[PDB]
Design a protein around this motif. Sequence first.
Motif, PDB file in Angstrom:
ATOM      1  N   UNK A   7       0.799  -1.215   0.000  1.00  0.00           N
ATOM      2  CA  UNK A   7       0.000   0.000   0.000  1.00  0.00           C
ATOM      3  C   UNK A   7       0.836   1.271   0.000  1.00  0.00           C
TER       4      UNK A   7
ATOM      5  N   UNK B 153     -13.409  -3.583 -11.385  1.00  0.00           N
ATOM      6  CA  UNK B 153     -12.582  -2.703 -10.573  1.00  0.00           C
ATOM      7  C   UNK B 153     -11.706  -3.447  -9.574  1.00  0.00           C
TER       8      UNK B 153
ATOM      9  N   UNK C 200      -8.598  -4.887  -7.828  1.00  0.00           N
ATOM     10  CA  UNK C 200      -7.248  -4.377  -7.838  1.00  0.00           C
ATOM     11  C   UNK C 200      -7.143  -2.871  -7.823  1.00  0.00           C
ATOM     12  N   UNK C 201      -8.261  -2.159  -7.899  1.00  0.00           N
ATOM     13  CA  UNK C 201      -8.236  -0.706  -7.894  1.00  0.00           C
ATOM     14  C   UNK C 201      -7.819  -0.184  -6.528  1.00  0.00           C
TER      15      UNK C 201
ATOM     16  N   UNK D  94      -7.344  -1.794  -1.220  1.00  0.00           N
ATOM     17  CA  UNK D  94      -7.495  -2.380  -2.542  1.00  0.00           C
ATOM     18  C   UNK D  94      -8.802  -3.156  -2.597  1.00  0.00           C
TER      19      UNK D  94
ATOM     20  N   UNK E 124      -9.030   4.201 -13.787  1.00  0.00           N
ATOM     21  CA  UNK E 124      -8.663   4.247 -12.380  1.00  0.00           C
ATOM     22  C   UNK E 124      -7.291   3.615 -12.196  1.00  0.00           C
ATOM     23  N   UNK E 125      -6.693   3.871 -11.038  1.00  0.00           N
ATOM     24  CA  UNK E 125      -5.382   3.326 -10.719  1.00  0.00           C
ATOM     25  C   UNK E 125      -5.506   1.947 -10.085  1.00  0.00           C
ATOM     26  N   UNK E 126      -4.465   1.138 -10.263  1.00  0.00           N
ATOM     27  CA  UNK E 126      -4.374  -0.191  -9.680  1.00  0.00           C
ATOM     28  C   UNK E 126      -3.192  -0.241  -8.727  1.00  0.00           C
ATOM     29  N   UNK E 127      -3.397  -0.867  -7.568  1.00  0.00           N
ATOM     30  CA  UNK E 127      -2.382  -0.819  -6.522  1.00  0.00           C
ATOM     31  C   UNK E 127      -1.169  -1.672  -6.871  1.00  0.00           C
TER      32      UNK E 127
END
Lengths: 63, 282, 49, 59, 59, 40, 46
Positions: B272, E14, E16-17, E28, F1-4
């Motif tokens: 994270x 969505x 993994x966003x 996540x 959107x972003x992915x971690x």
Amino acid sequence: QLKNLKAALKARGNPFEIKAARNKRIAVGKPGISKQIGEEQRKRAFEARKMMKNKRGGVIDKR
Amino acid sequence: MLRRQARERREYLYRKAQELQDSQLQQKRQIIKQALAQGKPLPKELAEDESLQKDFRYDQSLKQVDDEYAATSGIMDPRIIVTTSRDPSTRLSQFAKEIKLLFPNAVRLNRGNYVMPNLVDACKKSGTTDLVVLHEHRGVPTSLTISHFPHGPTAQFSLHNVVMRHDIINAGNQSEVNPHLIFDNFTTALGKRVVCILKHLFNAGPKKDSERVITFANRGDFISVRQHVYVRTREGVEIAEVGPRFEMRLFELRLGTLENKDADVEWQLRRFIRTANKKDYL
Amino acid sequence: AKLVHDVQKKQHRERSQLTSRSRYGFLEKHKDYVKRAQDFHRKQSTLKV
Amino acid sequence: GLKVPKAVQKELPFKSQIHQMKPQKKKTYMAKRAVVLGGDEKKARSFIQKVLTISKAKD
Amino acid sequence: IKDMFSSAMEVARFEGAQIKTVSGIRGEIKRALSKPEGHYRAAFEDKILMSDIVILRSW
Amino acid sequence: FDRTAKPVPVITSEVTESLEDMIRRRIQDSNFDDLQRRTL
Amino acid sequence: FEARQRIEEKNKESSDYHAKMAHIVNTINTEEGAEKNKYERERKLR
RNA sequence: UGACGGAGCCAGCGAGUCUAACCUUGGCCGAGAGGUCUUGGUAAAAACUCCGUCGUAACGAGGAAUUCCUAGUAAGCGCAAGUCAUCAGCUUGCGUUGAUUACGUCCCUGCCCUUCACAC
Ligand SMILES: [Mg+2]
Ligand SMILES: [Mg+2]
Ligand SMILES: [Mg+2]
């Protein structure tokens, strides 16, 4: 496996690419080949979208 | 035994703390050695240290594998116990057998009702060198942890794209020679640490003509594990997969046995943090 | 404060919990979260000792 | 406040053992005997603990 | 988490966003829950509260 | 959107061929990274 | 698949930006600093 | 080697001011925001021991093949937690009850190794 490998080659001079089921009464597919086709088709589709993102004109071929 | 194991850890931990302090001293001695050989002037801090120069006469006559493995590296073959989680499914039991065949000196042990402290304490009595514990999700292997005795390290892996050998038809029996090992693309210090952990699960000194090869290939922190049998042909080499196939991704490395949840963490995966996806650590 | 207008240094007001969620309590912000995390780590540190 | 597990608390070295006094339930004889001066002394005893409350807060 | 999505099909798009709370705790979207539709499982860097609100930034 | 995080790699046929080429090369050159018995 | 492309594109863009910003700073420091140090020496000579 | 009821009784893990429903019927107050009450529907230790009662379309314990398994093991039972990967269509722990059969052999099937006294 190697003993079969040596016997086959001396006669001539990868079973993990196939998923095989159990016969209750056999090769079922091709995980490697099927995924590649499924991944390449969406790869070219993604390429088309990045080409289409910022265009307003286009050749209109009516032939 | 319990008292002996305790003090051996305290002495080992104390040694690490002192070595970190002594690292500065070692660099200073290196500068003096270079200055004497090159003839270049010594820096001001070192020029005024009379205690260091006096010590240098004794310390002039001073001169790899990780310290946990250095004692037995290449002398004593490993002893490995492969176990699973409580009440394992049939596939996990099959996979545990496959992992047992992978390592020449492995022994599969049923984990019925065994508690973790007893398992490691029993393993330490018997002279076991490594312990391997496997987890699943609906008969699909998910995790693999390797604990090195008597004092660690413990490395936990997560398994992806697992293809067992029982999924194959008429595959046949494996060869159980001491296999050749391939470790590719392990560059960082953490990679060297991971390689040392995995290298010492195998016996030392395979025969040059050994016909079994196990390869761990690092590709973006996903280590692909493959097992092949090769035949040297007149114009090259032909290899054939024996399996199983699976990719492990390290996500924890602790300085202690797997029982010790309080062991100091040598490395952990930060998922994270903002720049997580940018860099590959291994 | 050199080359900065007072308009730039304007207060940005703090938003509040939704009425549909008023029962659950006060909407925590970053400062509130820091108080939780610090307190938890202080206790977990002693317990490990 | 922090609550140490009793399993941890049991096997602690003599130097570091937490002293946790249990509450009293049975009424002690001395507790039944003590005289509390009421009336004027109550007011002179509320007054003091009000003053010491201001002083501790001001500091 | 609930009320983010209407059906498990939307969640799958969505997965993994990146998500975060008002507190700033990052997380996540892991997987969609089979029951009820639109709910999903998430992992956060730290424990969140019931009063928190999770937000997914999109454009 | 972003992915971690990056998704888990997919083992395509091209990936396996690249892996096999490496293994054949290492065997052909006879270079392996394996533990060696220490003298004495 | 889309996630993989976006991450790789973003990492490439960031790497290019950092190289570009470093270059403009380094070139300015080297070339303008040389002129600055040159002029200051002439002032000292005066 | 049942169902129902009652009675007796035995664990070990686990402690972040943190733990947690949905959809309605209406009363009142309030400029609004909203607050409070009312209302119907939907969802959500066990084993063990003793005592008493009854009573013996699909499927009635799962074919051929194939896999695994040696002691606190196989199997049964419940209780917790969800610990940066994985997991809730579940995962991992914890305790409880606890066996039958082998522990020999290279006959078959595979893998492997070999070709400083005295005595041989
Ligand atoms: Mg069992
Ligand atoms: Mg169970
Ligand atoms: Mg399980």
